[PDB]
Write a protein that binds this ligand. Structure first.
Ligand code: HEM
Ligand code: HEM
Ligand SMILES: [Mg+2]
Lengths: 109, 110
């Protein structure tokens, strides 16, 4: 079975679009053996905080862990700040939460 | 134009995720919809008292999804689906569902 890891970003209202633009060019995730796909989504119809989800699809959980442990993961996140960080005041990113999934079925037309 | 994702999130009785996922192996018309691209059916990995299965559908547009939602094939696919809360839902492990909708701002394929 494939594996999915989600990073769920809790953002200030209206900041989804500027946040998504940060994901346009790859920073090495694609070099990890077992990486397959990524989607970056904006949750529609939110009334409070904006929500952006980063969905990554892998041949296995092991592949994902390999990326978490990689230098490219660190490089991609080096200038990322939460609003709570000492130098993070201007960041619209409030928090993140990671979700993990077994992919029990996939179909493509 | 951006792809669109619709999610149906199922809250399930503990232990019923795998049997529920098997119900999605066979297509029931969604593949005939103009704009339909992909589906993923997932089980959440956690320590909660209920199982959670998500059905993620990926479309060329929200319009395409709306067409499917209102279609005969949607009705056909779901005609025998019951919730535990239904009068005739005794054999159903499905406690509830909730729909979520997303704009896909970016996609990359290796
Ligand atoms: C620790 C909290 C995290 C925050 C606040 C965060 C936020 C961000 C931001 C803002 C970017 C774009 C960076 C830039 O401007 O160059 C990024 C990159 C990325 N993040 Fe996170 N992230 C976190 C951890 C994670 C985790 C745990 C995952 C696992 C799914 C993840 C998935 C990704 C991916 C796939 C990229 C693109 C990587 C690449 O192209 O190589 N992030 N993250
Ligand atoms: C009314 C609440 C719903 C429940 C309880 C439910 C549950 C189910 C179940 C158990 C199946 C397998 C059918 C079978 O056993 O033959 C199914 C089919 C399916 N459901 Fe739902 N569903 C609901 C509405 C939705 C919605 C709103 C979506 C939108 C994402 C969706 C997406 C799908 C898809 C893509 C299939 C496969 C259709 C095909 O192959 O043609 N469902 N649903
Ligand atoms: Mg808004």
């Amino acid at each position: 079975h494939m594996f999915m890891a989600e990073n769920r970003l809790q953002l200030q209202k209206g900041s989804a679009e500027e946040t998504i633009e940060r994901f346009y060019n790859r920073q090495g995730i694609e070099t990890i053996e077992g990486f397959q796909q990524m989607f970056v989504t904006k949750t529609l119809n939110t009334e409070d905080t904006d929500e952006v989800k980063i969905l990554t699809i892998w041949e296995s959980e092991d592949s994902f862990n390999n990326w978490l442990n990689s230098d490219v993961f660190k490089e991609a996140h080096k200038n990322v700040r939460l609003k709570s960080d000492d130098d993070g005041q201007q960041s619209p990113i409030l928090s993140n939460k990671v979700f993990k999934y077994d992919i029990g079925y996939h179909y493509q037309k």
